[PDB]
Design an enzyme around this catalytic site. Structure first.
Site, short mmCIF file in Angstrom:
data_model
loop_
_atom_site.label_atom_id
_atom_site.label_comp_id
_atom_site.label_asym_id
_atom_site.label_seq_id
_atom_site.Cartn_x
_atom_site.Cartn_y
_atom_site.Cartn_z
CG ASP A 9 -1.20 -1.25 4.05
OD1 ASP A 9 -1.51 -0.66 3.05
OD2 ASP A 9 -1.93 -2.31 3.84
CD1 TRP A 10 -5.02 -2.03 5.75
CD2 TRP A 10 -6.26 -1.07 7.82
NE1 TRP A 10 -6.50 -1.08 5.47
CE2 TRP A 10 -6.59 -0.45 6.33
CE3 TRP A 10 -6.01 -0.73 9.15
CZ2 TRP A 10 -7.45 -0.11 6.68
CZ3 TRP A 10 -7.52 -0.23 9.13
CH2 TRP A 10 -8.36 0.07 8.41
CD1 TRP A 56 -4.89 -1.69 -1.89
CD2 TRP A 56 -2.83 -2.69 -2.31
NE1 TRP A 56 -4.92 -2.38 -0.78
CE2 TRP A 56 -3.25 -2.87 -0.87
CE3 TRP A 56 -1.91 -2.79 -2.17
CZ2 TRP A 56 -2.40 -3.37 -0.06
CZ3 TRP A 56 -1.22 -3.75 -2.00
CH2 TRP A 56 -1.09 -3.32 -0.21
CG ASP A 108 3.98 2.63 -1.49
OD1 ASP A 108 2.85 1.69 -2.53
OD2 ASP A 108 3.06 2.72 -0.95
CG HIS A 151 1.95 -0.95 -0.26
ND1 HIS A 151 1.74 0.39 0.08
CD2 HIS A 151 2.08 -1.91 0.80
CE1 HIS A 151 0.73 0.44 0.78
NE2 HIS A 151 0.50 -1.01 1.10
#
Ligand SMILES: [Cl-]
Ligand SMILES: [Cl-]
Length: 310
Positions: free
Chosen positions: A124-125, A175, A260, A289
């Protein structure tokens, strides 16, 4: 200095399977007045360091199943909390959170701790940002473990890294809606939805950092930054594509959480091609995810992969 608040330490008293002691960096360059939390586990003098970067809306707690595995192999493990998250201080204004605010924090952390021989571990980030770090100091980085992640380039350059924003409706769109719309955002409930294998206690650990909405500005800003990418982000991210294709020569391991709806195969097979030397992914059928919730397997298989390519 930035206007920020600090989660009371008592919020972390009751935590499920998080025995890792706190470490803090105060007033990093560029971050006066801000205290950052990080885990520093395993042999402090180890040659190898696993730098484990979390994403939205999590913290180093997400790595709790991976950290012991890496440490037991004789490596050091560094797992920082971004400002806005975990045990780090939390700017109260969304405007203070930007791509480069977070990126430069990571660069400052690496330099402050003088981390070398790094295995970068991202999702992710943690990947949107972390994948842009090696080109800034390439001799520090040795290996990559990439879970569900990509680069925040423009849609023309890599359409796969933008298409997910608008379809499916129940993916990133859902999300983001879940994160930016409630006046009373409950991250325990969010995490039980998006990581349906969590126990109640585990989900509560994701709420622990946030006594109320005033602590959640960094949480609100992250999905806004996926949908609205500033020019610095786009340019850095496009430069990172070139790094991974043309400059990277390190050992690489990919794992995909197949359930995901955000950053699954649609994004990860394009990423595999862009990372020079990236092998076929480990597909984890039941992982979503938050691939690190199946992270014992990722860590053990990554180590095995690195041992056979040493
Ligand atoms: Cl899950
Ligand atoms: Cl996000």
């Amino acid at each position: 200095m930035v206007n920020a608040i600090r989660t009371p330490d008592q919020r972390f008293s009751n935590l499920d399977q998080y025995p890792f002691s706190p470490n803090y960096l105060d007033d990093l360059p560029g971050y006066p007045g801000l205290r950052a939390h990080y885990l520093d586990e395993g042999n402090s003098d180890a040659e190898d360091v696993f730098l484990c970067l979390h994403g939205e809306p999590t913290w180093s707690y997400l790595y709790r199943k991976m950290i012991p595995v890496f440490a037991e192999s004789g490596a050091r493990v560094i797992a920082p909390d971004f400002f806005g998250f975990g045990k780090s201080d939390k700017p109260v204004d969304e405007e203070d959170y930007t791509f480069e605010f977070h990126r430069n924090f990571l660069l400052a952390l690496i330099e402050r701790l003088d981390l070398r021989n790094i295995t970068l571990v991202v999702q992710d980030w943690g990947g949107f940002l972390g994948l842009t770090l090696p080109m800034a100091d390439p001799s520090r980085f040795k290996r990559l473990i990439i879970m569900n992640a990509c680069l925040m380039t423009d849609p023309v350059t890599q359409p796969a890294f933008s298409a997910f924003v608008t379809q499916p409706a129940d993916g990133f769109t859902a999300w983001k809606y879940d994160l930016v719309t409630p006046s009373d955002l409950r991250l325990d409930q969010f995490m039980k939805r998006w990581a349906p294998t969590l126990t109640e206690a585990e989900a509560s650990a994701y709420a622990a950092p946030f006594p109320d909405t005033s602590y959640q500005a960094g949480v609100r800003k992250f999905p806004k930054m996926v949908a609205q990418r500033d020019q610095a982000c786009i340019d850095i991210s496009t430069e990172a594509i070139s790094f991974w294709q043309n400059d990277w020569n390190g050992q690489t391991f990919m794992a995909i959480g197949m359930k995901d709806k955000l950053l699954g195969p649609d994004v990860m097979y394009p990423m595999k091609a862009l990372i020079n030397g990236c092998p076929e992914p480990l597909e984890i059928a039941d992982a979503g995810h938050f691939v690190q919730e199946f992270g014992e397997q990722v860590a053990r298989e990554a180590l095995k992969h690195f041992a056979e390519t040493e």
